[PDB]
C-alpha cells in the first residue's frame, strides 16, 4: 500500500472528523513533523489548556499508521476519544488541541493588548505577533497562524480601535456563481454591525454599531480558507484556483513575501442526509486521491471545483519542502 493512501473507517457521525483528517494528513509541514519524530521533544504535559500531550500522542500514532503504508485503511478511535475530551467548527477545535499539546510556552505570560494609538500598523502589527508568541509557540503556529488586521470605528465617539489578531484560518463570506477573489474581497469590505452583532466601545462603555472593516496583515505557510456556507446551506458555486492562488493584492504589509499558493486539498461537504469526504494531494506522487471515509480512489484537478467543496487548504510556494522558487 502506499504511504498516506489510506482511509479512515466512519466510527458513527463525527461530522467531518475524517474528512479533516485527510486535509491534515495531507498538510505536508505538519505530517513531515510527526512522521520525523519531532514532536516528543515539545509535548507540553502541563498545560491547563492542553490534553497533557494525549491529542498529540494519539493524532501522532494514528499519522504513523496511515504513512506506514501497511493500511489500506484505519480507524481513527483512539484520536477521536481524546478530541472528544477536548471539545464537548472541529477544525479550530483540532488545531486548537494539537497546539496546545505541542506549546513550547510553559506558563503563558498575562499581556495587555495595546490599542493601536495612531501608532503605525507595522509597528502594532508586530507587537501583537511578538505579544502571540510570548504565549503560544507552537508547530501548529508555525504552519497555520496568520494575522489580520481589525477597525472598528465608532458611530458615536468616533473613536477608531485598531487591533491585529492572530487566525489559524480565514471564514470567508459568500458572494449563483462567484470566484475565490470575490470572496475575499467581501471578507475585507467594510460593512456596519448590526444589532445582533454590536461592539463595546471603550470610550463611552456602550455597544455601538460600529463600521467593521478588515485587513490581512500576514499569510501562514498553509492557508486554511473556510466558505461559510452554514450561518439552511448556500450551495453557491465558488471557484477556487488549483495553482498559482496570488494573495499579494490583499496583503496590507509591505514586506510580505511572495504569497503565492497551490491547492493541496479540500473538505467537500454533500446533502446538509449530510456527508464530508476530501479531495487530497498526495506529497509523494503529486496525484490527486478522494477520500470517502475507508476509500481512496484516483482523481483528476478538474473535479475539484464544486458546489460541494467547504474547506480550502492551500500552501504557500516558499514553503514548499525540497524546492527552492
Ligand atoms: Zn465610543
Same mark, same amino acid.
Request: aromatic letters at 12%.
Given at each position: 500500500?502506499?504511504?498516506?493512501?489510506? *482511509?479512515?473507517?466512519?466510527? *458513527?457521525?463525527?461530522?467531518?472528523?475524517?474528512?479533516?483528517?485527510?486535509?491534515?494528513?495531507?498538510?505536508?509541514?505538519?505530517?513531515?513533523?510527526?512522521?520525523?519524530?519531532?514532536?516528543?521533544?515539545?509535548?507540553?504535559?502541563?498545560?491547563?489548556? #492542553?490534553?497533557?500531550?494525549?491529542?498529540?500522542?494519539?493524532?501522532?500514532?494514528?499519522?504513523?499508521?496511515?504513512?506506514?503504508?501497511?493500511?489500506?485503511?484505519?480507524?481513527?478511535?483512539?484520536?477521536?476519544?481524546?478530541?472528544?475530551?477536548?471539545?464537548?467548527?472541529?477544525?479550530?477545535?483540532?488545531?486548537?488541541?494539537?497546539?496546545?499539546?505541542?506549546?513550547?510556552?510553559?506558563?503563558?505570560?498575562?499581556?495587555?493588548?495595546?490599542?493601536?494609538? *495612531?501608532?503605525?500598523?507595522?509597528?502594532? &502589527?508586530?507587537?501583537?505577533?511578538?505579544?502571540?508568541?510570548?504565549?503560544?509557540?507552537?508547530?501548529?503556529?508555525?504552519?497555520?497562524? *496568520?494575522?489580520?488586521?481589525?477597525?472598528?470605528?465608532?458611530?458615536?465617539?468616533?473613536?477608531?480601535?485598531?487591533?491585529?489578531?492572530?487566525?489559524?484560518?480565514?471564514?470567508?463570506? /459568500?458572494?449563483?456563481?462567484?470566484?475565490?477573489?470575490?470572496?475575499?474581497?467581501?471578507?475585507?469590505?467594510?460593512?456596519?454591525?448590526?444589532?445582533?452583532?454590536?461592539?463595546?466601545?471603550?470610550?463611552?462603555?456602550?455597544?455601538? @454599531?460600529?463600521?467593521?472593516?478588515?485587513?490581512?496583515?500576514?499569510?501562514?505557510?498553509?492557508?486554511?480558507?473556510?466558505?461559510?456556507?452554514?450561518?439552511?446551506? /448556500?450551495?453557491?458555486?465558488?471557484?477556487?484556483?488549483?495553482?498559482?492562488?496570488?494573495?499579494?493584492?490583499? /496583503?496590507?504589509?509591505?514586506? &510580505?513575501?511572495?504569497?503565492?499558493?497551490? /491547492?493541496?486539498?479540500?473538505?467537500?461537504?454533500?446533502?446538509? #442526509?449530510?456527508?464530508?469526504?476530501?479531495?487530497?494531494?498526495?506529497?509523494?506522487?503529486?496525484?490527486?486521491?478522494?477520500?470517502?471515509?475507508?476509500?481512496?480512489?484516483?482523481?483528476?484537478?478538474?473535479?475539484?471545483?464544486?458546489?460541494?467543496?467547504?474547506?480550502?487548504?492551500? @500552501?504557500?510556494?516558499?514553503?514548499?519542502?525540497?524546492?527552492?522558487?
Amino acid at each position: 500500500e502506499q504511504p498516506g493512501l489510506c *482511509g479512515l473507517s466512519n466510527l *458513527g457521525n463525527t461530522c467531518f472528523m475524517n474528512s479533516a483528517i485527510q486535509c491534515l494528513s495531507n498538510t505536508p509541514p505538519l505530517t513531515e513533523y510527526f512522521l520525523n519524530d519531532k514532536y516528543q521533544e515539545e509535548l507540553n504535559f502541563d498545560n491547563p489548556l #492542553g490534553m497533557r500531550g494525549e491529542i498529540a500522542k494519539s493524532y501522532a500514532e494514528l499519522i504513523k499508521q496511515m504513512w506506514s503504508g501497511k493500511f489500506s485503511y484505519v480507524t481513527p478511535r483512539a484520536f477521536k476519544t481524546q478530541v472528544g475530551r477536548f471539545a464537548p467548527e472541529l477544525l479550530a477545535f483540532l488545531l486548537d488541541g494539537l497546539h496546545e499539546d505541542l506549546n513550547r510556552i510553559r506558563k503563558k505570560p498575562y499581556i495587555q493588548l495595546k490599542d493601536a494609538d *495612531g501608532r503605525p500598523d507595522k509597528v502594532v &502589527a508586530e507587537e501583537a505577533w511578538e505579544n502571540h508568541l510570548k504565549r503560544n509557540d507552537s508547530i501548529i503556529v508555525d504552519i497555520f497562524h *496568520g494575522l489580520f488586521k481589525s477597525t472598528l470605528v465608532c458611530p458615536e465617539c468616533a473613536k477608531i480601535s485598531v487591533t491585529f489578531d492572530p487566525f489559524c484560518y480565514l471564514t470567508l463570506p /459568500l458572494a449563483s456563481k462567484v470566484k475565490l477573489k470575490d470572496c475575499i474581497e467581501l471578507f475585507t469590505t467594510k460593512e456596519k454591525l448590526g444589532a445582533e452583532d454590536p461592539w463595546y466601545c471603550p470610550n463611552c462603555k456602550e455597544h455601538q @454599531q460600529a463600521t467593521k472593516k478588515l485587513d490581512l496583515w500576514s499569510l501562514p505557510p498553509v492557508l486554511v480558507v473556510h466558505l461559510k456556507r452554514f450561518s439552511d446551506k /448556500l450551495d453557491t458555486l465558488v471557484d477556487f484556483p488549483i495553482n498559482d492562488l496570488d494573495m499579494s493584492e490583499f /496583503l496590507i504589509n509591505p514586506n &510580505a513575501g511572495p504569497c503565492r499558493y497551490n /491547492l493541496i486539498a479540500v473538505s467537500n461537504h454533500y446533502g446538509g #442526509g449530510g456527508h464530508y469526504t476530501a479531495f487530497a494531494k498526495n506529497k509523494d506522487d503529486g496525484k490527486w486521491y478522494y477520500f470517502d471515509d475507508s476509500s481512496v480512489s484516483t482523481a483528476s484537478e478538474d473535479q475539484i471545483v464544486s458546489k460541494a467543496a467547504y474547506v480550502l487548504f492551500y @500552501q504557500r510556494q516558499d514553503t514548499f519542502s525540497g524546492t527552492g522558487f
